A paper describes a structure:
TRIM5α is a restriction factor that intercepts the incoming capsids of diverse retroviruses, including HIV-1, and inhibits viral replication. Like all TRIM proteins, TRIM5α consists of an N-terminal tripartite or RBCC motif (RING, B-box 2, and coiled-coil domains), followed by a C-terminal domain. Higher-order assembly of TRIM5α requires the B-box 2 domain, which is thought to mediate three-fold symmetric interactions that connect coiled-coil mediated TRIM5α dimers into a hexagonal net. We therefore engineered artificial constructs – which we call miniTRIMs – that retain the integrated B-box/coiled-coil fold of the full-length dimer but are more amenable to biochemical and structural analyses.
Residue numbers in the entry:
A (entry chain D): 95 to 226
B (entry chain A): 95 to 228
The structure:
């Protein structure tokens, strides 16, 4: 609830640092020219954003998994040289679906929690979504 | 010590309003376009200004009071046609010194007081003192 460096209320949010800060941080050279807001001014924008992200990921993950299970059902009938690559593909899908499970878990937490939960480090996960 | 509206520490100063305010005052629509500073950024100059004013008024006061007593001393001695004018001059001095006493008292309050006491409405009292002569 209070700034480690200044002891003032952690009520502001710095977009560039993706960090909740206090009014004295905001005046300081360390955040000079940064875009800073009350958390309450940006919470709803960020909530909407992550919500839609969560929806997109859940679908993308469902779709990945139906594909994965089709590749799984396909392995038995298939010849060897095809079998190996399909299994590799399934490996890749497993990797993807894991990654999306982690992302979905973080988005659910952030969307269920406080504003500070919502916002703190939020650029990290936004960029992880981008990097898919 | 704390903002009457937001409960935050009163550490900032609005130049257009001559008002002591907090960081939540500062960022609101009411002051966003105003020039705001930490009190501590402007305090020394204001303190010096009010001390100088105080000294100047102390001297103008001394001078008026001495004249006032010379007139008072002269009145008994005076002929009929001078007495009226003397009485009146003494009155006019009485008023001037009263006004100066009030100004001096406010300056003393401000110079002895908190930073907030110093700065709240400070442009106002400066201007009223300037206006006496000009
Ligand atoms: Zn801080
Ligand atoms: Zn920053
Ligand atoms: Zn305030
Ligand atoms: Zn103002």
């Amino acid at each position: 609830d209070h700034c480690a460096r200044h002891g003032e209320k952690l009520l502001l949010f710095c977009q560039e640092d993706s960090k909740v800060i206090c009014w004295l941080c905001e005046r300081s050279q360390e955040h000079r020219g940064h875009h800073t807001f009350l958390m309450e001014e940006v919470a709803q924008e960020y909530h909407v954003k992550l919500q839609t992200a969560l929806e997109m990921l859940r679908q993308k993950q469902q779709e990945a998994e139906t594909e994965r299970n089709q590749v799984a059902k396909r392995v038995p009938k298939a010849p060897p040289e095809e079998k190996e690559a399909l299994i590799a593909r399934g490996k890749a899908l497993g990797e993807q679906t894991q990654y999306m499970r982690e992302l979905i878990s973080e988005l659910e937490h952030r969307l269920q929690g406080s504003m500070m939960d919502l916002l703190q480090g939020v650029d990290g996960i936004i960029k992880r979504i981008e990097n898919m």
